Amino acid sequence: MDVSFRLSGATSSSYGVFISNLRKALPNERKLYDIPLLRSSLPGSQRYALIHLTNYADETISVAIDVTNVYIMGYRAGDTSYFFNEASATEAAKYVFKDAMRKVTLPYSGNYERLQTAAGKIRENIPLGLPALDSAITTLFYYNANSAASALMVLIQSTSAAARYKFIEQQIGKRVDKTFLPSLAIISLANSWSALSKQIQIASTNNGQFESPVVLINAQNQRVTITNVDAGVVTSNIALLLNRNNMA
Ligand SMILES: Nc1ncnc2[nH]cnc12
Numbered sequence: 001m002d003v004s005f006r007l008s009g010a011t012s013s014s015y016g017v018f019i020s021n022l023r024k025a026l027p028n029e030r031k032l033y034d035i036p037l038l039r040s041s042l043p044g045s046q047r048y049a050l051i052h053l054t055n056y057a058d059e060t061i062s063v064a065i066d067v068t069n070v071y072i073m074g075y076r077a078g079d080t081s082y083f084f085n086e087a088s089a090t091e092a093a094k095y096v097f098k099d100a101m102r103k104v105t106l107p108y109s110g111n112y113e114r115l116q117t118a119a120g121k122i123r124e125n126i127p128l129g130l131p132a133l134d135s136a137i138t139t140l141f142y143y144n145a146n147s148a149a150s151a152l153m154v155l156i157q158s159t160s161a162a163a164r165y166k167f168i169e170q171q172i173g174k175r176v177d178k179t180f181l182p183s184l185a186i187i188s189l190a191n192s193w194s195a196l197s198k199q200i201q202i203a204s205t206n207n208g209q210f211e212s213p214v215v216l217i218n219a220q221n222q223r224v225t226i227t228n229v230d231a232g233v234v235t236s237n238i239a240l241l242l243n244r245n246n247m248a
Pocket of ligand 1: 070071072073110111112156160161
């Protein structure tokens with residue numbers, strides 16, 4: 001099921017609607033502690049969804065995600081598709097954007113370490129917020145090799161990461177007419193998503209206790225060691241769980 005967000009006329013509330021809609025597009029059979037557990041595996045015909053994004057200037061891209069893990073596989077602009085250079089995206093390309101005339105395989109996977117190398121910049125120095133998503137859409141719609149990695153990191157954080165964590169949703173959406181640099185809390189949450197997901201699943205079998213702690217950096221910049229499901233990150237932040245059988 002497809003989802004969309006339009007930057008023209010956007011508000012913090014319409015972004016909230018977009019992120020709720022994105023979360024709702026992701027299949028789950030169960031919740032653990034009131035958090036959706038994503039599917040471990042889906043047939044090809046069920047595995048992908050499109051996010052349609054339109055910038056201030058009415059230019060649109062379509063972004064393919066794997067709905068088992070929220071990972072961006074690639075995007076389409078007009079008659080050209082762009083996929084990450086990795087196994088998952090190669091498989092996605094058999095299912096989405098099939099009638100694109102030209103297909104570009106980007107020179108990196110969609111892994112953050114690869115992207116930052118490619119961008120020449122770390123996440124903390126790349127602006128986010130709604131106007132940043134507008135610029136990322138423009139940058140990718142008129143693809144330019146030297147600018148695309150930074151734009152894809154804005155895209156990832158503005159969609160996937162926001163869907164995974166209410167904190168990230170709220171921080172991005174608040175910036176309607178301005179931009180901001182993500183705090184270490186945003187970096188830390190994004191870094192730890194797989195690990196936190198794994199530990200919450202283990203917790204379900206271990207009376208709410210993690211088997212291994214997750215070190216996070218909180219909104220006050222304190223470094224914290226999280227050990228169970230009564231932690232605020234679990235009660236009041238994470239919004240999706242990566243299935244333990246879809247990690248490695
Ligand atoms: N390509 C991607 N899509 C979603 N989340 C990600 N985190 C890092 N890379 C990602």
